């Protein structure tokens, strides 16, 4: 379940809560 | 169909003309992405190749660099990289090195490919004899000149080559640039790319 930062537009994976690269919360 | 798209970081000195370069892809600053938290700006820079479009989503400072390095979250999961220096200026090309540590220090051994810019300018300083670091490290070179969007889509379709792994690869068009705000003299241009060729005959 791997989801795209809608804040910077990088790929993260479905563990992550926050976008690994800008810190953004996954919507 | 899911599109494809790949993370570019673009580094180098303040004032090498970063932003200038990435702006000529009209599309992609009109679409650009500010990210607050990192002072970021990613520009969308779709281009049309013979196997589709492929999307360089590429991450432009806000000068920061000027002020030492830059923070992990700017490098992490980048998949490729343009590393800028600028031909006028011998320490932009002489701190090469240090982008290049601090970018493979977080994403190891992604494509990178060296971008000598402002290339426009008759007194050039850094020539094509002076120009090694790519030939030690694996790398690419072109010069580039961003004003005059001379050879624009050269890092791009090297890029591009190496991701899909498809030496073939070539863009079916030119995406839509900024109209040049100088003129690259052709003639200039000939002699700056035989001076690399000759330059990738030396030995070492
Ligand atoms: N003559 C010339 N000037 C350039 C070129 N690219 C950038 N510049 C100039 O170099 C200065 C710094 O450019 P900038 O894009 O802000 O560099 P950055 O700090 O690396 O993002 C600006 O005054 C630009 O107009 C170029 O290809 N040719
Ligand atoms: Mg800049
Ligand atoms: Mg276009
Ligand atoms: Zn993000």
């Known amino acids: ?3 795209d930062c809608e804040v ?3 790929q993260n994976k479905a563990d992550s809560t926050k976008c690994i690269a800008c810190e953004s919360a996954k919507p | 169909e899911p599109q494809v798209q790949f993370k570019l970081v673009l580094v180098g000195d303040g ?31 779709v281009f049309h190749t013979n196997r589709g479009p492929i999307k360089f989503n590429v991450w432009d400072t806000a000068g ?24 006028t200026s011998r320490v ?12 493979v220090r ?5 494509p990178i490919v060296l971008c000598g810019n402002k290339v426009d300018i008759k007194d050039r300083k850094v020539k094509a004899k002076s120009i090694v670091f ?23 379709l090297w890029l591009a080559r190496k991701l899909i792994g498809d030496p073939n690869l070539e863009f079916v068009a030119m ?22 060729e000759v330059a990738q005959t030396t030995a070492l």
């Open chain 1, 1 to 3: 379940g791997s989801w």
């Open chain 1, 8 to 10: 910077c537009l990088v």
């Open chain 2, 15 to 45: 004032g090498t003309g970063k932003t200038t370069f990435v702006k000529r892809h009209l599309t992609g600053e009109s679409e650009k992405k500010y990210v607050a938290t990192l002072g970021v700006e990613v520009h969308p820079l």
């Open chain 2, 64 to 87: 920061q660099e000027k002020f030492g390095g830059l923070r992990d979250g700017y490098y992490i999961q980048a998949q490729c990289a343009i590393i800028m220096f600028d031909v």
């Open chain 2, 92 to 103: 932009t090309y002489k701190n090469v090195p240090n982008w290049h540590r601090d970018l």
């Open chain 2, 106 to 110: 977080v994403c190891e051994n992604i």
């Open chain 2, 134 to 156: 790519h030939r030690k490290k694996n790398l690419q070179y072109y010069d580039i000149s961003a004003k005059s969007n001379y050879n624009f889509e050269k890092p791009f």
């Open chain 2, 175 to 196: 995406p839509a640039l900024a109209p040049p705000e100088v003129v690259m003299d052709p003639a200039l241009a000939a002699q700056y790319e035989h001076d690399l």
